[PDB]
Amino acid sequence: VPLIGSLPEARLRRVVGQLDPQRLWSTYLRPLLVVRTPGSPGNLQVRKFLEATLRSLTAGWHVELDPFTASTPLGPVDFGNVVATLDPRAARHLTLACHYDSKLFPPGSTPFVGATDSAVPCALLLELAQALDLELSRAKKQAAPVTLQLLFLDGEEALKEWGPKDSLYGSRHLAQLMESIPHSPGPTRIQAIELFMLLDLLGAPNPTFYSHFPRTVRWFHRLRSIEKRLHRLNLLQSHPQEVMYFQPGEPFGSVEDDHIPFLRRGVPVLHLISTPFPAVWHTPADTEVNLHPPTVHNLCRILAVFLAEYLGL
Numbered sequence: 001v002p003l004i005g006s007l008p009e010a011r012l013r014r015v016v017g018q019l020d021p022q023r024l025w026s027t028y029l030r031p032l033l034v035v036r037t038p039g040s041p042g043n044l045q046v047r048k049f050l051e052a053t054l055r056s057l058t059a060g061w062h063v064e065l066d067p068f069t070a071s072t073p074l075g076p077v078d079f080g081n082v083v084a085t086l087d088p089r090a091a092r093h094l095t096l097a098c099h100y101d102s103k104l105f106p107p108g109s110t111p112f113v114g115a116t117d118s119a120v121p122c123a124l125l126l127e128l129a130q131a132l133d134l135e136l137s138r139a140k141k142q143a144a145p146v147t148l149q150l151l152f153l154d155g156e157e158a159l160k161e162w163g164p165k166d167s168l169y170g171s172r173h174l175a176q177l178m179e180s181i182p183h184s185p186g187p188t189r190i191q192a193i194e195l196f197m198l199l200d201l202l203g204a205p206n207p208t209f210y211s212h213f214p215r216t217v218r219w220f221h222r223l224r225s226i227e228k229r230l231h232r233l234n235l236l237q238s239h240p241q242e243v244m245y246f247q248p249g250e251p252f253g254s255v256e257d258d259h260i261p262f263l264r265r266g267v268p269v270l271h272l273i274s275t276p277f278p279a280v281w282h283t284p285a286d287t288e289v290n291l292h293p294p295t296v297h298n299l300c301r302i303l304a305v306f307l308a309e310y311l312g313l
């Protein structure tokens with residue numbers, strides 16, 4: 001319950017109280033729930049929405065695009081990762097990541113908007129940044145040596161399920177780009193990532209998470225402890241058992257995802273992905289109505305506490 005490095009209770013309740021469920025849902029999630037396949041108008045509109053939202057935060061994040069053109073099974077397609085670094089001068093950062101593209105389906109199909117995959121992850125990152133904006137701003141003004149970075153990756157999904165190189169367009173490109181850019185102390189932007197936490201497949205009822213990387217299990221245990229704590233504090237909804245989400249062991253592994261290009265370059269990863277996947281995965285039923293709002297807000301609360309403890313907010 002109260003572990004070393006945990007927020008005092010009154011600090012925890014104020015952090016959770018800064019979250020706004022209506023804002024998460026309407027301001028951050030709803031605008032994303034459009035078809036947003038790489039290169040589409042909808043994808044570009046979501047990119048600009050992310051950029052503008054992030055630039056509006058009073059903490060004054062450094063927000064930049066990583067745009068590029070890559071070969072795909074459909075020919076050349078443009079991709080653009082959105083990279084938000086709160087304090088670009090800090091030595092290192094906690095990096096939270098997700099993908100903002102939606103998987104392309106055949107024409108004539110019921111449109112796929114990927115509510116869990118990964119509109120909810122994207123919206124959670126925006127809500128965290130906003131809810132903690134005053135605290136993040138003060139940490140930056142105090143020149144904290146560990147800042148926060150948010151990555152909204154493009155092109156995670158295969159365009160045509162056309163083999164292993166038809167995937168991870170944005171993350172492959174960004175990891176290579178970061179390895180080419182000096183950082184202090186660095187020596188490159190890859191080494192600035194103290195921990196890479198990838199959110200994926202979130203918002204369905206009854207998710208289960210396992211630790212996929214022994215290297216980062218301490219952070220998995222922290223998330224579990226936060227779940228338990230929030231449960232006992234009467235701060236979770238529709239959560240009848242003390243531990244439901246963060247499970248022990250590893251009955252299902254990690255799957256290929258946007259962490260891989262980072263992992264292969266030595267970055268420590270925590271893969272916050274439901275396994276088994278949502279029932280709706282990769283079907284057009286992955287929509288807003290099939291989300292479970294209490295679970296979305298429960299995850300948001302867990303993550304807010306994690307972020308405040310990790311960064312000393």
Ligand SMILES: C[As](C)(=O)[O-]
Pocket residue numbers: 099117156157200201255256257
């Ligand atoms: C973002 As995925 C787990 O559907 O490849």
Ligand SMILES: [Zn+2]
Pocket residue numbers: 103117157282
């Ligand atoms: Zn997917």
